[PDB]
Protein backbone atom coordinates (compact mmCIF):
# COMPACT_ATOMS: atom_id res chain seq x y z
CA UNK A 1 0.00 0.00 0.00
CA UNK A 2 1.73 3.15 1.27
CA UNK A 3 4.24 3.91 4.00
CA UNK A 4 3.10 5.50 7.26
CA UNK A 5 5.09 8.47 8.50
CA UNK A 6 5.21 11.97 9.96
CA UNK A 7 7.68 13.52 7.48
CA UNK A 8 7.05 11.63 4.23
CA UNK A 9 6.97 13.20 0.78
CA UNK A 10 8.08 16.53 2.25
CA UNK A 11 11.13 17.22 0.07
CA UNK A 12 9.76 20.60 -1.07
CA UNK A 13 7.08 21.32 1.55
CA UNK A 14 9.03 21.75 4.79
CA UNK A 15 12.27 22.67 3.01
CA UNK A 16 13.76 26.13 3.37
CA UNK A 17 13.14 28.62 0.52
CA UNK A 18 15.71 30.01 -1.92
CA UNK A 19 18.45 32.09 -0.20
CA UNK A 20 16.72 31.63 3.18
CA UNK A 21 19.05 29.05 4.74
CA UNK A 22 20.56 29.13 8.22
CA UNK A 23 20.08 32.66 9.51
CA UNK A 24 16.54 33.10 10.86
CA UNK A 25 15.06 36.60 11.37
CA UNK A 26 13.83 37.67 14.81
CA UNK A 27 10.51 39.27 13.81
CA UNK A 28 8.11 36.51 14.89
CA UNK A 29 9.83 35.70 18.20
CA UNK A 30 9.70 39.02 20.05
CA UNK A 31 6.15 39.93 19.03
CA UNK A 32 3.07 38.56 20.78
CA UNK A 33 -0.45 37.52 19.80
CA UNK A 34 -3.77 37.93 21.58
CA UNK A 35 -6.33 35.21 22.26
CA UNK A 36 -8.42 34.30 19.23
CA UNK A 37 -6.34 35.58 16.30
CA UNK A 38 -6.51 34.30 12.72
CA UNK A 39 -3.30 32.31 12.20
CA UNK A 40 -2.48 30.02 9.27
CA UNK A 41 0.37 27.50 9.40
CA UNK A 42 3.42 27.38 7.13
CA UNK A 43 6.12 24.77 7.69
CA UNK A 44 9.76 25.34 8.53
CA UNK A 45 12.86 23.18 8.23
CA UNK A 46 14.99 24.66 11.01
CA UNK A 47 12.48 23.66 13.72
CA UNK A 48 12.77 20.02 14.84
CA UNK A 49 11.05 19.92 18.24
CA UNK A 50 7.30 20.53 18.24
CA UNK A 51 6.72 20.23 14.49
CA UNK A 52 3.30 20.22 12.83
CA UNK A 53 2.26 17.13 10.92
CA UNK A 54 2.48 17.16 7.12
CA UNK A 55 -1.34 17.24 6.76
CA UNK A 56 -1.64 20.60 8.57
CA UNK A 57 -0.03 22.89 5.98
CA UNK A 58 -1.99 26.05 5.21
CA UNK A 59 -4.78 25.49 7.75
CA UNK A 60 -6.39 28.51 9.39
CA UNK A 61 -7.17 28.50 13.09
CA UNK A 62 -7.55 30.64 16.20
CA UNK A 63 -5.60 30.65 19.46
CA UNK A 64 -7.28 29.18 22.54
CA UNK A 65 -4.35 28.99 24.99
CA UNK A 66 -1.05 30.88 25.22
CA UNK A 67 1.82 29.01 26.88
CA UNK A 68 5.51 29.97 26.93
CA UNK A 69 6.97 28.13 23.91
CA UNK A 70 4.22 26.23 22.06
CA UNK A 71 0.93 28.13 21.90
CA UNK A 72 -2.32 26.35 21.15
CA UNK A 73 -4.57 26.75 18.13
CA UNK A 74 -7.98 25.34 17.16
CA UNK A 75 -7.52 24.22 13.56
CA UNK A 76 -10.49 23.16 11.43
CA UNK A 77 -9.45 19.78 10.06
CA UNK A 78 -11.54 18.36 7.21
CA UNK A 79 -10.99 14.62 7.53
CA UNK A 80 -12.81 12.03 5.38
CA UNK A 81 -15.36 11.54 8.16
CA UNK A 82 -16.42 15.10 9.00
CA UNK A 83 -15.14 18.55 9.96
CA UNK A 84 -13.52 18.84 13.39
CA UNK A 85 -12.43 21.97 15.25
CA UNK A 86 -9.50 20.27 16.91
CA UNK A 87 -6.79 21.64 19.21
CA UNK A 88 -3.04 21.39 18.55
CA UNK A 89 0.09 22.96 20.07
CA UNK A 90 2.44 24.76 17.67
CA UNK A 91 5.56 26.77 18.54
CA UNK A 92 5.96 30.44 17.56
CA UNK A 93 7.92 29.86 14.33
CA UNK A 94 5.01 28.37 12.34
CA UNK A 95 2.86 31.50 12.66
CA UNK A 96 1.98 33.88 9.81
CA UNK A 97 -0.29 36.91 9.45
CA UNK A 98 -3.42 37.69 7.43
CA UNK A 99 -4.41 41.10 6.07
CA UNK A 100 -7.99 39.99 5.28
CA UNK A 101 -9.09 40.30 8.92
CA UNK A 102 -7.29 43.65 9.22
CA UNK A 103 -9.03 44.98 6.09
CA UNK A 104 -12.36 43.65 7.39
CA UNK A 105 -11.88 45.43 10.73
CA UNK A 106 -10.87 48.67 9.01
CA UNK A 107 -13.92 48.38 6.73
CA UNK A 108 -16.23 47.82 9.72
CA UNK A 109 -14.61 50.81 11.47
CA UNK A 110 -15.07 52.99 8.36
CA UNK A 111 -18.71 51.87 8.08
CA UNK A 112 -19.29 52.72 11.75
CA UNK A 113 -17.62 56.10 11.18
CA UNK A 114 -19.88 56.82 8.20
CA UNK A 115 -22.89 55.65 10.25
CA UNK A 116 -22.06 58.07 13.07
CA UNK A 117 -21.33 60.77 10.48
CA UNK A 118 -24.25 62.76 8.99
CA UNK A 119 -26.74 61.63 11.63
CA UNK A 120 -28.06 65.19 11.96
CA UNK A 121 -28.27 65.39 8.16
CA UNK A 122 -30.31 62.21 7.69
CA UNK A 123 -28.86 60.81 4.47
CA UNK A 124 -28.63 57.19 3.35
CA UNK A 125 -25.11 55.80 2.88
CA UNK A 126 -24.17 52.90 0.59
CA UNK A 127 -22.39 50.54 3.00
CA UNK A 128 -22.56 47.11 1.36
CA UNK A 129 -20.21 45.83 -1.35
CA UNK A 130 -22.33 46.18 -4.47
CA UNK A 131 -21.03 43.67 -7.06
CA UNK A 132 -19.47 44.78 -10.38
CA UNK A 133 -22.18 46.10 -12.72
CA UNK A 134 -21.98 46.49 -16.50
CA UNK A 135 -20.49 49.75 -17.78
CA UNK A 136 -22.32 53.02 -18.37
CA UNK A 137 -22.83 54.35 -21.90
CA UNK A 138 -20.41 57.06 -23.01
CA UNK A 139 -19.33 59.04 -26.07
CA UNK A 140 -16.26 57.80 -27.95
CA UNK A 141 -14.15 60.70 -29.19
CA UNK A 142 -12.03 60.64 -32.34
CA UNK A 143 -10.08 63.20 -34.38
CA UNK A 144 -7.61 63.22 -37.25
CA UNK A 145 -6.81 59.53 -37.56
CA UNK A 146 -8.93 56.68 -38.95
CA UNK A 147 -9.09 53.04 -37.80
CA UNK A 148 -6.72 50.97 -39.93
CA UNK A 149 -8.14 48.09 -41.99
CA UNK A 150 -6.09 45.16 -40.73
CA UNK A 151 -5.75 42.04 -42.87
CA UNK A 152 -4.41 38.59 -41.89
CA UNK A 153 -0.98 37.21 -42.82
CA UNK A 154 -0.07 34.15 -44.95
CA UNK A 155 1.37 30.98 -43.49
CA UNK A 156 5.11 30.43 -43.10
CA UNK A 157 7.00 27.36 -41.93
CA UNK A 158 8.10 27.66 -38.30
CA UNK A 159 11.12 25.33 -38.09
CA UNK B 1 57.47 60.65 2.04
CA UNK B 2 57.07 57.36 3.89
CA UNK B 3 54.93 57.13 7.04
CA UNK B 4 56.74 55.71 10.10
CA UNK B 5 53.54 53.65 10.62
CA UNK B 6 54.59 51.65 7.52
CA UNK B 7 57.94 50.37 8.80
CA UNK B 8 58.34 46.70 7.89
CA UNK B 9 59.69 44.42 10.61
CA UNK B 10 59.94 40.77 11.61
CA UNK B 11 56.97 39.25 13.44
CA UNK B 12 58.21 35.75 14.29
CA UNK B 13 60.45 32.83 13.39
CA UNK B 14 59.07 29.32 13.02
CA UNK B 15 61.58 26.58 13.90
CA UNK B 16 60.30 23.07 13.21
CA UNK B 17 62.22 19.79 13.50
CA UNK B 18 60.85 16.64 11.81
CA UNK B 19 63.28 13.75 12.12
CA UNK B 20 60.70 11.10 11.24
CA UNK B 21 61.44 9.04 14.35
CA UNK B 22 59.77 8.79 17.75
CA UNK B 23 61.27 8.10 21.16
CA UNK B 24 64.94 8.94 21.66
CA UNK B 25 65.47 11.06 18.53
CA UNK B 26 62.44 13.23 19.38
CA UNK B 27 63.60 14.05 22.91
CA UNK B 28 67.19 14.59 21.76
CA UNK B 29 65.82 17.01 19.16
CA UNK B 30 63.82 18.72 21.91
CA UNK B 31 66.95 19.06 24.08
CA UNK B 32 68.60 21.08 21.29
CA UNK B 33 65.72 23.59 21.33
CA UNK B 34 65.86 23.56 25.14
CA UNK B 35 69.57 24.47 25.06
CA UNK B 36 69.03 27.08 22.33
CA UNK B 37 65.87 28.95 23.38
CA UNK B 38 65.13 27.75 26.91
CA UNK B 39 61.41 27.04 26.71
CA UNK B 40 58.97 24.19 26.13
CA UNK B 41 58.23 23.58 22.42
CA UNK B 42 54.97 22.29 20.97
CA UNK B 43 54.95 18.71 19.68
CA UNK B 44 52.92 17.31 16.78
CA UNK B 45 51.50 13.89 15.97
CA UNK B 46 50.88 11.82 12.86
CA UNK B 47 47.77 11.78 10.66
CA UNK B 48 47.21 8.08 9.92
CA UNK B 49 49.07 4.79 9.68
CA UNK B 50 51.39 4.58 6.66
CA UNK B 51 53.31 1.38 5.95
CA UNK B 52 55.86 3.20 3.78
CA UNK B 53 57.20 5.61 6.40
CA UNK B 54 56.60 3.23 9.30
CA UNK B 55 54.34 5.40 11.47
CA UNK B 56 50.98 4.83 13.15
CA UNK B 57 48.02 6.87 14.33
CA UNK B 58 48.53 9.20 17.34
CA UNK B 59 52.33 9.08 17.48
CA UNK B 60 54.53 12.12 18.04
CA UNK B 61 56.99 12.82 15.21
CA UNK B 62 57.81 16.52 14.79
CA UNK B 63 58.23 19.44 17.17
CA UNK B 64 58.08 23.19 16.52
CA UNK B 65 58.63 26.42 18.44
CA UNK B 66 57.50 29.84 17.18
CA UNK B 67 60.21 32.13 18.56
CA UNK B 68 59.37 35.82 19.00
CA UNK B 69 61.23 38.88 20.22
CA UNK B 70 64.98 39.47 20.27
CA UNK B 71 65.67 35.73 20.59
CA UNK B 72 64.25 35.19 17.08
CA UNK B 73 66.48 38.02 15.83
CA UNK B 74 69.55 36.42 17.47
CA UNK B 75 68.76 32.96 16.05
CA UNK B 76 68.18 34.56 12.63
CA UNK B 77 71.55 36.30 13.03
CA UNK B 78 73.05 32.85 13.65
CA UNK B 79 71.30 31.62 10.50
CA UNK B 80 72.66 34.49 8.42
CA UNK B 81 76.13 33.84 9.86
CA UNK B 82 75.81 30.21 8.71
CA UNK B 83 74.37 31.03 5.27
CA UNK B 84 76.95 33.89 4.73
CA UNK B 85 74.24 36.34 3.54
CA UNK B 86 72.94 34.57 0.44
CA UNK B 87 69.61 32.95 -0.47
CA UNK B 88 67.82 31.36 -3.42
CA UNK B 89 64.73 32.18 -5.46
CA UNK B 90 62.77 29.06 -4.48
CA UNK B 91 63.18 29.78 -0.75
CA UNK B 92 61.00 32.89 -1.02
CA UNK B 93 57.27 32.24 -1.12
CA UNK B 94 54.82 34.16 -3.31
CA UNK B 95 53.14 35.66 -0.23
CA UNK B 96 56.37 36.88 1.36
CA UNK B 97 56.99 34.75 4.45
CA UNK B 98 60.03 32.66 3.65
CA UNK B 99 61.88 29.63 4.97
CA UNK B 100 65.12 27.75 4.40
CA UNK B 101 66.48 24.60 6.03
CA UNK B 102 69.93 23.82 7.40
CA UNK B 103 71.75 20.50 7.67
CA UNK B 104 73.79 20.62 10.88
CA UNK B 105 73.71 22.73 14.04
CA UNK B 106 77.46 22.85 14.76
CA UNK B 107 77.80 25.82 12.39
CA UNK B 108 75.50 27.88 14.64
CA UNK B 109 77.93 27.85 17.57
CA UNK B 110 76.39 25.18 19.78
CA UNK B 111 78.91 22.61 21.01
CA UNK B 112 78.25 19.11 19.66
CA UNK B 113 77.67 16.29 22.17
CA UNK B 114 78.18 12.72 20.90
CA UNK B 115 75.08 11.36 22.65
CA UNK B 116 72.58 13.89 21.26
CA UNK B 117 73.23 13.83 17.51
CA UNK B 118 72.91 16.16 14.54
CA UNK B 119 69.61 18.06 14.32
CA UNK B 120 68.93 20.75 11.74
CA UNK B 121 65.87 22.95 11.31
CA UNK B 122 64.00 25.42 9.09
CA UNK B 123 64.20 29.20 9.62
CA UNK B 124 60.68 30.19 8.57
CA UNK B 125 60.85 33.98 8.88
CA UNK B 126 57.45 35.65 9.18
CA UNK B 127 57.74 39.40 8.50
CA UNK B 128 55.14 42.01 9.31
CA UNK B 129 53.87 45.57 9.57
CA UNK B 130 51.98 47.59 12.21
CA UNK B 131 48.26 46.91 11.78
CA UNK B 132 47.74 43.13 11.76
CA UNK B 133 45.56 42.87 14.88
CA UNK B 134 42.30 43.21 12.92
CA UNK B 135 43.27 40.03 11.04
CA UNK B 136 43.40 38.13 14.37
CA UNK B 137 41.45 39.96 17.07
CA UNK B 138 38.24 39.10 18.89
CA UNK B 139 35.79 41.71 17.60
CA UNK B 140 36.11 42.00 13.81
CA UNK B 141 38.01 40.22 11.05
CA UNK B 142 38.36 41.38 7.46
CA UNK B 143 40.60 42.79 4.77
CA UNK B 144 43.62 44.90 5.73
CA UNK B 145 44.37 46.69 2.46
CA UNK B 146 46.12 46.21 -0.88
CA UNK B 147 48.75 48.87 -0.16
CA UNK B 148 49.10 47.37 3.34
CA UNK B 149 49.87 43.87 2.01
CA UNK B 150 53.54 42.90 1.70
CA UNK B 151 54.70 41.52 -1.65
CA UNK B 152 57.50 39.18 -2.69
CA UNK B 153 59.48 41.77 -4.67
CA UNK B 154 59.14 44.30 -1.84
CA UNK B 155 60.35 41.73 0.70
CA UNK B 156 63.34 40.78 -1.48
CA UNK B 157 64.37 44.40 -2.09
CA UNK B 158 63.93 45.16 1.63
CA UNK B 159 66.17 42.20 2.52
CA UNK B 160 68.75 43.29 -0.07
CA UNK B 161 68.70 46.90 1.14
CA UNK B 162 68.82 46.08 4.86
CA UNK B 163 70.92 42.95 5.33
CA UNK B 164 73.08 43.43 2.16
CA UNK B 165 72.53 39.84 1.05
CA UNK B 166 72.71 38.75 -2.57
CA UNK B 167 69.96 36.58 -4.06
CA UNK B 168 71.31 34.07 -6.58
CA UNK B 169 69.00 32.75 -9.32
CA UNK B 170 67.99 29.12 -9.01
Amino acid sequence: TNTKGKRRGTRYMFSRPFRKHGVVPLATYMRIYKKGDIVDIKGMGTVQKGMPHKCYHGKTGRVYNVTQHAVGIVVNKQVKGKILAKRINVRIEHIKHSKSRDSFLKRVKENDQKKKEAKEKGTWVQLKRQPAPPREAHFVRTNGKEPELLEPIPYEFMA
Amino acid sequence: KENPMRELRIRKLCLNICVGESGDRLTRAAKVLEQLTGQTPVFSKARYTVRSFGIRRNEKIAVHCTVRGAKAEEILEKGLKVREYELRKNNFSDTGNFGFGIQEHIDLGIKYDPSIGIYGLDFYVVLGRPGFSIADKKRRTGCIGAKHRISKEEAMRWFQQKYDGIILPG
Partner: protein, 293 residues
Protein backbone atom coordinates in the same frame (compact mmCIF):
# COMPACT_ATOMS: atom_id res chain seq x y z
CA UNK C 1 45.76 25.62 -14.56
CA UNK C 2 43.37 25.34 -11.62
CA UNK C 3 39.64 26.06 -11.74
CA UNK C 4 38.53 29.61 -10.96
CA UNK C 5 36.96 29.68 -7.49
CA UNK C 6 34.93 32.89 -7.91
CA UNK C 7 32.49 31.59 -10.51
CA UNK C 8 29.29 33.27 -11.68
CA UNK C 9 27.30 30.30 -10.37
CA UNK C 10 28.92 30.95 -6.98
CA UNK C 11 27.92 34.63 -7.21
CA UNK C 12 24.34 33.59 -8.01
CA UNK C 13 24.05 30.91 -5.31
CA UNK C 14 26.08 32.67 -2.59
CA UNK C 15 23.70 33.63 0.22
CA UNK C 16 24.65 36.68 2.28
CA UNK C 17 23.98 36.98 6.01
CA UNK C 18 22.62 39.92 7.99
CA UNK C 19 24.29 43.34 8.05
CA UNK C 20 25.37 43.22 11.70
CA UNK C 21 26.37 39.58 11.19
CA UNK C 22 28.68 40.60 8.34
CA UNK C 23 30.02 43.46 10.47
CA UNK C 24 30.66 40.98 13.29
CA UNK C 25 29.19 42.91 16.21
CA UNK C 26 25.83 41.29 16.96
CA UNK C 27 25.89 37.68 18.20
CA UNK C 28 22.36 36.55 17.38
CA UNK C 29 22.57 33.12 19.07
CA UNK C 30 23.43 34.66 22.44
CA UNK C 31 21.30 37.78 21.88
CA UNK C 32 18.12 35.73 21.30
CA UNK C 33 18.72 33.74 24.49
CA UNK C 34 19.16 37.06 26.30
CA UNK C 35 16.02 38.61 24.79
CA UNK C 36 13.78 35.57 25.40
CA UNK C 37 10.35 36.58 26.70
CA UNK C 38 7.33 34.47 27.63
CA UNK C 39 4.25 34.91 25.46
CA UNK C 40 1.86 34.98 28.43
CA UNK C 41 3.44 38.20 29.73
CA UNK C 42 1.33 40.31 27.30
CA UNK C 43 3.71 43.16 26.31
CA UNK C 44 5.97 43.26 29.36
CA UNK C 45 8.96 45.54 28.55
CA UNK C 46 12.18 43.64 29.25
CA UNK C 47 14.79 46.18 30.34
CA UNK C 48 18.47 45.29 29.98
CA UNK C 49 21.77 47.03 30.74
CA UNK C 50 24.47 46.95 28.07
CA UNK C 51 28.19 47.49 28.75
CA UNK C 52 30.57 48.40 25.93
CA UNK C 53 34.31 48.86 26.41
CA UNK C 54 36.07 51.51 24.35
CA UNK C 55 39.80 52.31 24.78
CA UNK C 56 38.99 55.31 27.00
CA UNK C 57 35.22 55.58 27.49
CA UNK C 58 32.98 52.97 29.13
CA UNK C 59 29.53 52.99 27.52
CA UNK C 60 26.70 51.94 29.86
CA UNK C 61 23.35 51.98 28.06
CA UNK C 62 19.89 50.86 29.16
CA UNK C 63 17.63 49.36 26.49
CA UNK C 64 14.26 47.66 26.08
CA UNK C 65 13.00 45.62 23.15
CA UNK C 66 10.64 47.22 20.62
CA UNK C 67 9.64 46.05 17.14
CA UNK C 68 10.93 49.16 15.34
CA UNK C 69 14.12 49.29 17.42
CA UNK C 70 15.33 49.02 21.01
CA UNK C 71 15.10 52.61 22.22
CA UNK C 72 17.76 53.90 24.62
CA UNK C 73 16.11 55.55 27.61
CA UNK C 74 19.36 56.48 29.40
CA UNK C 75 23.10 56.17 28.89
CA UNK C 76 26.16 56.89 31.05
CA UNK C 77 29.61 57.85 29.77
CA UNK C 78 33.09 58.18 31.24
CA UNK C 79 34.08 61.44 29.50
CA UNK C 80 31.51 63.38 31.57
CA UNK C 81 33.59 62.74 34.73
CA UNK C 82 35.83 65.87 34.44
CA UNK C 83 32.56 67.85 34.57
CA UNK C 84 31.94 66.37 38.03
CA UNK C 85 35.61 66.84 38.88
CA UNK C 86 37.38 63.57 38.06
CA UNK C 87 40.64 64.62 36.40
CA UNK C 88 42.73 61.46 36.75
CA UNK C 89 41.65 57.82 36.53
CA UNK C 90 39.58 57.87 33.35
CA UNK C 91 39.41 54.11 32.61
CA UNK C 92 39.88 51.83 35.62
CA UNK C 93 37.87 49.72 38.06
CA UNK C 94 37.06 52.76 40.21
CA UNK C 95 35.84 54.75 37.18
CA UNK C 96 33.70 51.78 36.11
CA UNK C 97 32.25 51.54 39.63
CA UNK C 98 31.57 55.30 39.71
CA UNK C 99 29.96 55.16 36.24
CA UNK C 100 27.70 52.29 37.32
CA UNK C 101 26.78 54.01 40.58
CA UNK C 102 26.09 57.31 38.79
CA UNK C 103 23.91 55.51 36.23
CA UNK C 104 22.04 53.70 39.01
CA UNK C 105 21.38 56.87 41.02
CA UNK C 106 20.35 58.78 37.87
CA UNK C 107 17.99 55.93 36.94
CA UNK C 108 16.39 55.81 40.40
CA UNK C 109 16.13 59.62 40.42
CA UNK C 110 14.36 59.55 37.05
CA UNK C 111 11.93 56.82 38.16
CA UNK C 112 11.45 58.61 41.48
CA UNK C 113 13.08 56.29 44.01
CA UNK C 114 15.93 58.52 45.19
CA UNK C 115 15.32 58.45 48.96
CA UNK C 116 14.54 54.72 49.11
CA UNK C 117 17.70 52.59 48.60
CA UNK C 118 20.31 55.25 49.45
CA UNK C 119 23.03 52.71 48.64
CA UNK C 120 26.48 51.82 49.93
CA UNK C 121 28.22 55.14 50.52
CA UNK C 122 31.16 53.77 52.53
CA UNK C 123 32.22 51.15 49.99
CA UNK C 124 33.62 48.01 51.61
CA UNK C 125 32.92 45.07 49.30
CA UNK C 126 30.51 42.89 51.26
CA UNK C 127 27.57 41.23 49.54
CA UNK C 128 24.17 42.89 49.96
CA UNK C 129 21.28 41.66 47.82
CA UNK C 130 18.37 43.88 46.74
CA UNK C 131 15.27 42.83 48.68
CA UNK C 132 11.82 44.33 48.13
CA UNK C 133 10.90 46.72 50.95
CA UNK C 134 7.18 46.77 51.75
CA UNK C 135 5.07 49.92 51.72
CA UNK C 136 6.83 51.23 48.63
CA UNK C 137 6.11 49.38 45.34
CA UNK C 138 8.43 46.95 43.58
CA UNK C 139 11.90 48.23 42.76
CA UNK C 140 13.43 48.31 39.30
CA UNK C 141 15.22 45.24 37.97
CA UNK C 142 16.94 44.34 34.71
CA UNK C 143 19.32 41.82 33.14
CA UNK C 144 23.02 41.84 32.33
CA UNK C 145 24.40 42.17 28.79
CA UNK C 146 28.19 41.93 28.62
CA UNK C 147 28.78 41.45 24.89
CA UNK C 148 31.86 40.27 22.98
CA UNK C 149 34.16 39.95 25.98
CA UNK C 150 35.49 36.93 27.86
CA UNK C 151 34.48 37.13 31.53
CA UNK C 152 37.70 36.19 33.30
CA UNK C 153 38.52 36.68 36.99
CA UNK C 154 38.30 40.45 37.42
CA UNK C 155 36.67 42.84 34.94
CA UNK C 156 35.26 46.37 34.78
CA UNK C 157 31.93 44.94 33.56
CA UNK C 158 31.51 43.20 36.92
CA UNK C 159 32.55 46.42 38.66
CA UNK C 160 29.78 48.31 36.88
CA UNK C 161 27.50 45.39 37.77
CA UNK C 162 28.41 45.69 41.47
CA UNK C 163 27.86 49.44 41.22
CA UNK C 164 24.40 48.91 39.73
CA UNK C 165 23.56 46.38 42.48
CA UNK C 166 24.76 48.81 45.17
CA UNK C 167 22.76 51.60 43.54
CA UNK C 168 19.61 49.49 43.42
CA UNK C 169 19.45 47.55 40.14
CA UNK C 170 18.66 43.95 41.10
CA UNK C 171 20.60 41.89 38.55
CA UNK C 172 21.26 38.22 39.45
CA UNK C 173 24.93 37.21 39.49
CA UNK C 174 27.47 35.16 41.45
CA UNK C 175 30.71 35.90 43.30
CA UNK C 176 33.01 33.87 41.04
CA UNK C 177 34.20 36.33 38.37
CA UNK C 178 35.20 39.05 40.82
CA UNK C 179 38.72 40.45 41.34
CA UNK C 180 40.37 39.14 44.48
CA UNK C 181 38.74 35.74 44.10
CA UNK C 182 41.48 33.11 43.93
CA UNK C 183 41.22 30.53 41.16
CA UNK C 184 42.83 27.64 43.06
CA UNK C 185 42.03 28.18 46.75
CA UNK C 186 38.61 29.69 45.85
CA UNK C 187 37.72 32.20 48.58
CA UNK C 188 36.23 35.66 48.08
CA UNK C 189 38.52 38.15 49.83
CA UNK C 190 36.82 41.42 50.79
CA UNK C 191 40.09 43.06 51.89
CA UNK C 192 41.74 42.20 48.56
CA UNK C 193 38.63 43.36 46.67
CA UNK C 194 38.78 46.68 48.56
CA UNK C 195 42.32 47.10 47.17
CA UNK C 196 40.92 46.72 43.65
CA UNK C 197 38.15 49.21 44.47
CA UNK C 198 40.39 51.92 45.89
CA UNK C 199 43.45 51.40 43.67
CA UNK C 200 46.40 50.63 45.93
CA UNK C 201 47.94 48.23 43.39
CA UNK C 202 48.17 51.09 40.88
CA UNK C 203 49.54 53.67 43.34
CA UNK C 204 52.15 51.31 44.81
CA UNK C 205 53.52 50.58 41.34
CA UNK C 206 53.46 54.32 40.59
CA UNK C 207 55.62 54.84 43.70
CA UNK C 208 57.81 51.93 42.56
CA UNK C 209 58.32 53.55 39.15
CA UNK C 210 59.02 56.88 40.90
CA UNK C 211 61.73 55.10 42.89
CA UNK C 212 63.03 53.26 39.81
CA UNK C 213 63.11 55.60 36.80
CA UNK C 214 61.37 58.77 35.63
CA UNK C 215 61.34 58.09 31.87
CA UNK C 216 59.10 55.00 31.90
CA UNK C 217 56.98 56.64 34.62
CA UNK C 218 56.33 59.71 32.44
CA UNK C 219 55.75 57.49 29.39
CA UNK C 220 53.15 55.47 31.30
CA UNK C 221 51.58 58.57 32.89
CA UNK C 222 52.19 61.57 30.62
CA UNK C 223 49.22 63.84 31.38
CA UNK C 224 48.65 62.29 34.81
CA UNK C 225 51.74 64.15 36.04
CA UNK C 226 50.45 67.24 34.21
CA UNK C 227 47.19 67.01 36.16
CA UNK C 228 49.33 67.05 39.37
CA UNK C 229 47.58 64.35 41.46
CA UNK C 230 49.72 62.51 44.02
CA UNK C 231 48.93 58.89 44.98
CA UNK C 232 47.98 60.23 48.42
CA UNK C 233 45.46 62.43 46.59
CA UNK C 234 44.22 59.40 44.62
CA UNK C 235 42.33 57.92 47.58
CA UNK C 236 40.61 61.20 48.50
CA UNK C 237 39.81 62.04 44.86
CA UNK C 238 37.33 59.17 44.51
CA UNK C 239 35.93 60.02 47.95
CA UNK C 240 35.16 63.51 46.63
CA UNK C 241 33.90 61.95 43.38
CA UNK C 242 31.36 59.89 45.35
CA UNK C 243 30.04 63.13 46.89
CA UNK C 244 29.95 64.64 43.39
CA UNK C 245 27.80 61.68 42.29
CA UNK C 246 25.54 62.11 45.34
CA UNK C 247 25.15 65.84 44.63
CA UNK C 248 23.79 65.91 41.06
CA UNK C 249 23.00 62.60 39.32
CA UNK C 250 20.93 64.04 36.47
CA UNK C 251 22.58 65.38 33.30
CA UNK C 252 21.66 68.41 31.19
CA UNK C 253 22.08 68.29 27.42
CA UNK C 254 24.57 70.49 25.56
CA UNK C 255 23.44 73.47 23.44
CA UNK C 256 24.23 72.54 19.85
CA UNK C 257 26.24 74.85 17.61
CA UNK C 258 24.55 76.35 14.55
CA UNK C 259 25.09 74.25 11.42
CA UNK C 260 26.88 75.99 8.53
CA UNK C 261 24.73 73.80 6.20
CA UNK C 262 27.22 72.49 3.63
CA UNK C 263 27.36 69.03 2.08
CA UNK C 264 30.62 67.37 3.10
CA UNK C 265 29.57 64.21 1.26
CA UNK C 266 30.35 63.81 -2.43
CA UNK C 267 27.09 64.16 -4.41
CA UNK C 268 25.61 61.21 -6.27
CA UNK C 269 26.45 61.09 -9.98
CA UNK C 270 23.51 60.85 -12.36
CA UNK C 271 22.87 58.84 -15.52
CA UNK C 272 23.44 61.86 -17.78
CA UNK C 273 26.83 62.54 -16.17
CA UNK C 274 27.87 58.87 -16.42
CA UNK C 275 26.77 58.78 -20.07
CA UNK C 276 28.70 62.00 -20.74
CA UNK C 277 31.79 60.46 -19.09
CA UNK C 278 31.67 57.26 -21.14
CA UNK C 279 30.85 59.25 -24.30
CA UNK C 280 33.87 61.52 -23.78
CA UNK C 281 36.03 58.44 -23.17
CA UNK C 282 34.82 56.61 -26.29
CA UNK C 283 35.15 59.80 -28.34
CA UNK C 284 38.63 60.61 -27.02
CA UNK C 285 40.11 57.11 -27.42
CA UNK C 286 39.49 56.90 -31.18
CA UNK C 287 40.82 60.39 -31.92
CA UNK C 288 43.84 59.74 -29.68
CA UNK C 289 44.57 56.49 -31.55
CA UNK C 290 44.22 58.37 -34.85
CA UNK C 291 46.53 61.14 -33.60
CA UNK C 292 49.15 58.70 -32.31
CA UNK C 293 49.12 56.15 -35.14
Amino acid sequence: FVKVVKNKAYFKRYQVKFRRRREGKTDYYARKRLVIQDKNKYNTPKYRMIVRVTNRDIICQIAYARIEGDMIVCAAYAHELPKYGVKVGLTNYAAAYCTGLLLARRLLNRFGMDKIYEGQVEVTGDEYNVESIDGQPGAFTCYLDAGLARTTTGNKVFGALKGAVDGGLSIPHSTKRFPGYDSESKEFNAEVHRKHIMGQNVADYMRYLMEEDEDAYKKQFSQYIKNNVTPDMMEEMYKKAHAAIRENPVYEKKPKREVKKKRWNRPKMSLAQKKDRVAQKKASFLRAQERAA
